[PDB]
Write a protein that binds this ligand. Structure first.
Ligand SMILES: *C(=O)CCCCCCCCCCCCC
Lengths: 20, 350
């Protein structure tokens, strides 16, 4: 499932803001 | 509100007048910003509530009054090194000038030899992020409640020529009434034309940001589409292990919806997550009204939301003053102040 794929991904925790 | 409920569209002149007065208030503070309204020794530092690349946010206690606050501490040397001077000056100048029920209040600001400080009102309910991940997903009425507050907040912010550029559950705190308060104005900017800075959060970036195109306030409306999707599905419309893979998905345009999404939700999201800027809701001739008049928001009383008269879907547990149970634990580091002034010229207006 899409849900299972999300939970298995490395981006379920707090996501840092980006810039260059 | 009463008129808006009685005769739809009759509140038009009143909303216009409200925003006009709000702009007058904003511009006064924008043109002459408050400075140096507190100092470090007036606070007791308790616990870190969140961290970033060049700073952190701490729960503090104002010694004299007893009130708790969230203090954002930024290292001046790190800000300069990461080329974030203008952005930090943007953040403080905007925050001290704005006034809206769904924005976290800037109470005090000051600086010393080493750091910049922004003292915010403490919102003990925690980030939407924490609640969303734990529960899994919000129901559509639940998501709608939060979405409506963001719509009004963007209506307010865009009217002042402000672009927010960092919408995400992490930057949305839940207050004691169960209402949203937007935090982190690190990427906020007052801009009338277009702008070019690549900034934000990978999952929430509009395609025109990714493609180095130059963009306007329409990116906040795209970001709203991502937010509503994430709230209702429990995951973002575009996710992968690494940012490059995410950017590839955003620029393809293809979005898949969970089977439990209503027809109205899918339609709104197709219009918000729209690559074509001449077709994206919020960016058309009728502006924010295309969003507010959409079928998905038919049950929403917009003025009642603003007046905070609507019953929230959930109220966070409150254990007492200075409780951090709705926040994660972080590594504590001693706040050091140098005997030499660092980067004085760069941060003169702070
Ligand atoms: C009922 O219809 C009252 C008449 C209109 C008064 C509206 C005042 C507040 C407007 C809130 C909208 C916020 C827009 C950013």
């Amino acid at each position: 499932t899409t849900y299972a794929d999300f939970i298995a991904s490395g981006r379920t925790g707090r996501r840092a803001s980006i810039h260059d | 509100g009463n008129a808006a409920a009685a005769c739809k569209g009759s509140e038009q002149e009143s909303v216009k007048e409200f925003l006009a007065k709000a702009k007058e208030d904003f511009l006064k503070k924008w043109e002459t910003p408050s400075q140096n309204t507190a100092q470090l020794d007036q606070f007791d530092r308790i616990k870190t509530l969140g961290t970033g690349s060049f700073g952190r946010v701490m729960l503090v206690k104002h010694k004299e009054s007893g009130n708790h606050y969230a203090m954002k501490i930024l290292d001046k040397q790190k800000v300069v090194k990461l080329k974030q001077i203008e952005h930090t000056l943007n953040e403080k100048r905007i925050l001290q000038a704005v006034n809206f029920p769904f924005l976290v209040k800037l109470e005090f600001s000051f600086k010393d030899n080493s750091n910049l400080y922004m003292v915010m009102e403490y919102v003990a309910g925690g980030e939407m992020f924490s609640h969303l991940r734990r529960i899994g997903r919000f129901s559509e009425p639940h998501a709608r409640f939060y979405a409506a507050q963001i719509v009004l907040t963007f209506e307010y912010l865009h009217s002042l020529d402000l672009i927010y550029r960092d919408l995400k559950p992490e930057n949305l705190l839940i207050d004691q009434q169960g209402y949203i308060q937007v935090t982190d104005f690190g990427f906020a900017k007052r801009v009338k034309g277009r702008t070019w800075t690549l900034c934000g959060t990978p999952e929430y970036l509009a395609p025109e940001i990714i493609l180095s195109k130059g963009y306007n306030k329409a990116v906040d409306w795209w970001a709203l589409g991502v937010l509503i999707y994430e709230m209702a599905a429990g995951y973002p419309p575009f996710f992968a292990d690494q940012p490059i893979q995410i950017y590839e998905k955003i620029v393809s345009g293809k979005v898949r919806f969970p089977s439990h999404f209503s027809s109205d939700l899918k339609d709104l999201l197709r219009n918000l997550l729209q690559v074509d800027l001449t077709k994206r809701f919020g960016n058309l001739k009728n502006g924010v009204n295309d969003i507010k008049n959409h079928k998905w928001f038919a049950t929403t009383d917009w003025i009642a939301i603003y007046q905070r008269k609507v019953e929230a879907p959930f109220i966070p547990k409150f254990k007492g003053p200075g409780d951090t149970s709705n926040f994660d634990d972080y590594e504590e580091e001693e706040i050091r102040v140098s005997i030499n002034e660092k980067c004085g010229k760069e941060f003169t207006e702070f």
